[PDB]
Amino acid sequence: PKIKTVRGAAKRFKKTGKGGFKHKHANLRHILTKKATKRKRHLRPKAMVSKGDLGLVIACLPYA
Amino acid sequence: MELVLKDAQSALTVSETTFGRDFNEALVHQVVVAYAAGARQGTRAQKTRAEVTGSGKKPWRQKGTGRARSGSIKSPIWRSGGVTFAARPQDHSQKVNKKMYRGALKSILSELVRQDRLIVVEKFSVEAPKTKLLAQKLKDMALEDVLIITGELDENLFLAARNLHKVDVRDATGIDPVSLIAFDKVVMTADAVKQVEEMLA
Amino acid sequence: ARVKRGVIARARHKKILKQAKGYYGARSRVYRVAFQAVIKAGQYAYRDRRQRKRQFRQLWIARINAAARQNGISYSKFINGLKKASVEIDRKILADIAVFDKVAFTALVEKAKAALA
Amino acid sequence: MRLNTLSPAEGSKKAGKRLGRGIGSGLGKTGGRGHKGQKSRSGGGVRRGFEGGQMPLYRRLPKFGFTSRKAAITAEIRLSDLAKVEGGVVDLNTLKAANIIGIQIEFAKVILAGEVTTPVTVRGLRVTKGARAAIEAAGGKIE
RNA sequence: UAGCGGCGAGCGAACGGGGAGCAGCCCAGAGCCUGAAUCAGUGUGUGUGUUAGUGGAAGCGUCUGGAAAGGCGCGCGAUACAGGGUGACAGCCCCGUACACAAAAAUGCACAUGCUGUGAGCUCGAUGAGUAGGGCGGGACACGUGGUAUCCUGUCUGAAUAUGGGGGGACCAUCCUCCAAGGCUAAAUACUCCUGACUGACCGAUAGUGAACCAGUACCGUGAGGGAAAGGCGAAAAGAACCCCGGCGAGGGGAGUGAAAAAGAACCUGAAACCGUGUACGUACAAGCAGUGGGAGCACGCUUAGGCGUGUGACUGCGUACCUUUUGUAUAAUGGGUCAGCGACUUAUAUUCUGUAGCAAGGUUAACCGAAUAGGGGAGCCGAAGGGAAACCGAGUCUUAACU
RNA sequence: GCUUGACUGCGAGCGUGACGGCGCGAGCAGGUGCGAAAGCAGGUCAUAGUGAUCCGGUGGUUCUGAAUGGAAGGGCCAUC
Ligand SMILES: [Mg+2]
Ligand SMILES: [Mg+2]
Ligand SMILES: [Mg+2]
Ligand SMILES: [Mg+2]
Ligand SMILES: [Mg+2]
Ligand SMILES: [Mg+2]
Ligand SMILES: [Mg+2]
Ligand SMILES: [Mg+2]
Ligand SMILES: [Mg+2]
Ligand SMILES: [Mg+2]
Ligand SMILES: [Mg+2]
Ligand SMILES: [Mg+2]
Ligand SMILES: [Mg+2]
Ligand SMILES: [Mg+2]
Ligand SMILES: [Mg+2]
Ligand SMILES: [Mg+2]
Ligand SMILES: [Mg+2]
Ligand SMILES: [Mg+2]
Ligand SMILES: [Mg+2]
Ligand SMILES: [Mg+2]
Ligand SMILES: [Mg+2]
Ligand SMILES: [Mg+2]
Ligand SMILES: [Mg+2]
Ligand SMILES: [Mg+2]
């Protein structure tokens, strides 16, 4: 049968032009008063998935 | 390209793309193999450990007897009942790209011309549906194993050739790769040549 | 396409049993035992192609020692003398001469003694 | 050229691994699975994304965004496609007739990809600044 | 894919598009009308099919052999060289096959007619209430109560009624679209206990059905139930008259049959484990994975020896099986009494990479149609553009009031 | 003594982690405090003082809004 997509992964990763995946940074949901503005500012933009983790992401998203 | 007619001693202008191209062995091989695969009737089956007739009773208790542990009388290790990976009916057909199929035919036809196996005639017919009549005609033309391709399938010719094992009569739309290679000689009528050109283009 | 294994299996077993002829009891009769014996035998033979060379040199040396002492010199000194006299005859040949041509062996000893002097 | 003379091209047909068929093969006994463990068992192995019990990457990271639904019915047209409409007037209907976009497409935009060398009249389609220059340079009109 | 989801494991549409097949009607009623189609049954007459059948071509000589269909040499038939049998492999020996024909009687189907139940058409009406909807509790919808439309109803309620009502995914307005609470309806679709024909890169007696054989039997169980083993003389029984030993035995030796009886019914071929008889060599003062390296003597062949060949092997160096599992096994750790047969990385569908082949900014069709591996079919799918959560912009775009 | 730089958007380049992450940072734009001025200030001598994701809550922002106009719900930013 057709491979099924891990739906949770599909809501967290988006494929880019050259084949990488972008994702949102963690640690920016709650408990924010104690965090410094510099730290929070650097977490706001989207980031790329590291080389070590690409294999896992690709397995979860066969139709990306 | 000019194909000399055997009976008329007159040339017939044909396309160089169809009758003069080089022989691609790898392409022809793939198409020939696919044709044989498409003839297979994959009708067979064996019984797995689930389909063998018998009960699901454990033959003896797990521990206590000095015997190897058993669970089913239908185990593939045991005599009578098993077949670990039992076969099921399957389809062996392969996909041949339309362009690859046509390209193979062009290679085959071109090679036949180089090997002087393609005989082109104006017309090929018998007066009556009599096998004896056809046999004599072929003997006059020094032919035995021959694939005769005609523009229009003549009923008399078809009937006269049924009992000749080494002779096959076909129409232009019926050519297939294996047949062109299998038969020693291929006889084509002028009309058939034209239809083949348009088909292959 | 079911494949029966009988013909091929028989041929393989007979091949091993043919090499086990002469062996004792089950070692020349039963395949399981014969296979182990045939493997072992080959392992010894590989080792012994090397050991054969060691044993024969040892034999030649012992014979040269005896023959030299009959002429009044030890093997160690005899070899040294031949080296100093630039004689390149090997031990296989020396042992052969010591047994078959005792006169020629005496001449070799004298040459060795002269070089040592 | 005979049925007992045809050969495949070199490299086209590789053999195939057959496990558990002796020492000489190189895949005998364990058959490439190593010794013991979950991964050596028949039907054994962990599911996709499993990293032990550590919270997996696809659950450690936050979800973001939403699906538009308007994007599904929007398409982009290259300058190369303009010459395939057969008629000289590029509309939503004509593009669909030429099998360039799709029956459900409702909005289309022409972008600077490829080149247009024929006067065309684009009607009812958004055009990028770059594409506009190219079309007008070729002698076309964007209505 | 959109969604659903301890947003975990998982579950998973629709709109729209391409095909196969297509067919619409009746009551809730009264006049004008009448049997108008049609359907059901029952006749009859046709056509065709089923259930027995009939005819059906053409060869001899010679060699080998127990036997010719084989070899060799000449002939002949073929709309028949599908298949089977015959003393070895037969187009022409036999049964068939292609092809051409046949039904007293029963029956299927298609028609044409006869009869019977039937009853069109037209005008004017009418338009399915404990129902729709609601509250409570459940269930079904891809949709787990969620912001949840829609469907069903156990319980309690309860409208409007063409000037009316339902739906368009909370809900309201507008617009569009349809008419519930009565009922019929062929085709395309699913399946095979059973009948006939044909086919197989399906099996060939531990395989294939459990069962090639008097098998759901023998046997086991109170019962439900469980459930075997077991095929082959020869072309033809020509299956061994008669004689001899023996208990008017068993068994055997002759004779005879046969191509063959060492094909004799415990019957094709007849492997291995295992058990014997005969011959050559070794062996009764010598200590252990039984071999391996050296090696005398003896026997038998060869050769005019010729340190050749084959068998045996006194004496001597070296030498603690195999598998598995382990840091590590002669291990007194596991497994195997032996032989023969069987016994474990497969198959389907998706997805990615490599090789190879075709075509190339393009590549390729699926279902389906079809004179069927051809050709048709481009519905789709992947690629040629990306950035952004998105609107959107686009060789750029996002971020920011704006970017060095 | 005077004050709010315990600023907002960014960030060359480094350090340290398997990863999720964490840390140091000149300089640039806007606005600010102190000082006559050069200048200094994006918390505290430095190194502990902490909790992913999901599911919700509150404020802002038409970015989205299942016939259409709204709305509900969702997204984005701040925060619990
Ligand atoms: Mg937030
Ligand atoms: Mg039970
Ligand atoms: Mg079986
Ligand atoms: Mg096709
Ligand atoms: Mg290895
Ligand atoms: Mg193991
Ligand atoms: Mg381990
Ligand atoms: Mg492992
Ligand atoms: Mg299309
Ligand atoms: Mg006949
Ligand atoms: Mg109604
Ligand atoms: Mg309703
Ligand atoms: Mg209700
Ligand atoms: Mg709506
Ligand atoms: Mg059986
Ligand atoms: Mg047998
Ligand atoms: Mg008797
Ligand atoms: Mg026998
Ligand atoms: Mg002893
Ligand atoms: Mg241990
Ligand atoms: Mg050891
Ligand atoms: Mg042991
Ligand atoms: Mg012991
Ligand atoms: Mg044991």
Curated annotation (Swiss-Prot), chain A:
Gene3D superfamilies: 4.10.410.60. SUPFAM superfamilies: L35p-like. Residues 9-21 have a biased composition (Basic residues). GO terms for biological process: cytoplasmic translation. Keywords: Ribonucleoprotein, Ribosomal protein. GO terms for cellular component: cytoplasm; cytosolic large ribosomal subunit. InterPro entries: Ribosomal_bL35, Ribosomal_bL35-like, Ribosomal_bL35_CS, Ribosomal_bL35_sf. The keyword Ribonucleoprotein applies. GO terms for molecular function: structural constituent of ribosome. Residues 1-21 are annotated as: Disordered. Pfam families: Ribosomal_L35p. Part of the 50S ribosomal subunit. Belongs to the bacterial ribosomal protein bL35 family. This is Large ribosomal subunit protein bL35. It comes from Escherichia coli (strain K12).
From Swiss-Prot, chain B:
One of its GO terms (biological process) is response to antibiotic. It comes from the Bacteria. Residues 44-71 are annotated as: Disordered. The keyword rRNA-binding applies. InterPro entries: Ribosomal_uL4, Ribosomal_uL4-like, Ribosomal_uL4_dom_sf. One of its GO terms (molecular function) is translation repressor activity. Gene3D superfamilies: 3.40.1370.10. Keywords: Antibiotic resistance, Repressor, Ribonucleoprotein, Ribosomal protein, RNA-binding, rRNA-binding, Transcription, Transcription regulation, Transcription termination, Translation regulation. The keyword Protein transport does not apply. Changing K63E: In strain: N282; confers erythromycin resistance. Ribosomes bind erythromycin poorly and have reduced peptidyltransferase activity. GO terms for cellular component: cytoplasm; cytosol; cytosolic large ribosomal subunit; large ribosomal subunit. The erythromycin sensitive allele is dominant over the resistant allele. Part of the 50S ribosomal subunit. In TnaC-stalled ribosomes forms part of the binding pocket for L-Trp with the leader peptide and uL22. Belongs to the universal ribosomal protein uL4 family. One of the primary rRNA binding proteins, this protein initially binds near the 5'-end of the 23S rRNA. It is important during the early stages of 50S assembly. It makes multiple contacts with different domains of the 23S rRNA in the assembled 50S subunit and ribosome. PANTHER family: 50S RIBOSOMAL PROTEIN L4, LARGE RIBOSOMAL SUBUNIT PROTEIN UL4M. This is Large ribosomal subunit protein uL4. The gene is rplD.
From Swiss-Prot, chain C:
GO terms for cellular component: cytoplasm; cytosol; cytosolic large ribosomal subunit. Keywords: Ribonucleoprotein, Ribosomal protein, RNA-binding, rRNA-binding. The keyword Ribonucleoprotein applies. The keyword Ribonucleoprotein applies. Gene3D superfamilies: 6.10.160.10, Ribosomal protein L20. It comes from the Bacteria. GO terms for molecular function: large ribosomal subunit rRNA binding; mRNA binding; mRNA regulatory element binding translation repressor activity; structural constituent of ribosome. One of its GO terms (biological process) is cytoplasmic translation. Belongs to the bacterial ribosomal protein bL20 family. NCBIfam families: rplT_bact (TIGR01032). Part of the 50S ribosomal subunit. Contacts L21. One of the primary rRNA binding proteins, it binds close to the 5'-end of the 23S rRNA. It is important during the early stages of 50S assembly. This is Large ribosomal subunit protein bL20. The gene is rplT.
Curated annotation (Swiss-Prot), chain D:
One of its GO terms (biological process) is cytoplasmic translation. GO terms for molecular function: rRNA binding; structural constituent of ribosome. PROSITE patterns: RIBOSOMAL_L15. Residues 21-31 have a biased composition (Gly residues). One of its GO terms (cellular component) is cytosolic large ribosomal subunit. Residues 1-54 are annotated as: Disordered. SUPFAM superfamilies: Ribosomal proteins L15p and L18e. Transmembrane segments: none annotated. Pfam families: Ribosomal_L27A. Keywords: Ribonucleoprotein, Ribosomal protein, RNA-binding, rRNA-binding. Part of the 50S ribosomal subunit. Contacts the 5S rRNA. This protein binds the 5S rRNA. It is required for the late stages of subunit assembly, and is essential for 5S rRNA assembly onto the ribosome. HAMAP family: Ribosomal_uL15. Belongs to the universal ribosomal protein uL15 family. PANTHER family: 50S RIBOSOMAL PROTEIN L15 (PTHR12934), LARGE RIBOSOMAL SUBUNIT PROTEIN UL15M (PTHR12934:SF11). This is Large ribosomal subunit protein uL15.
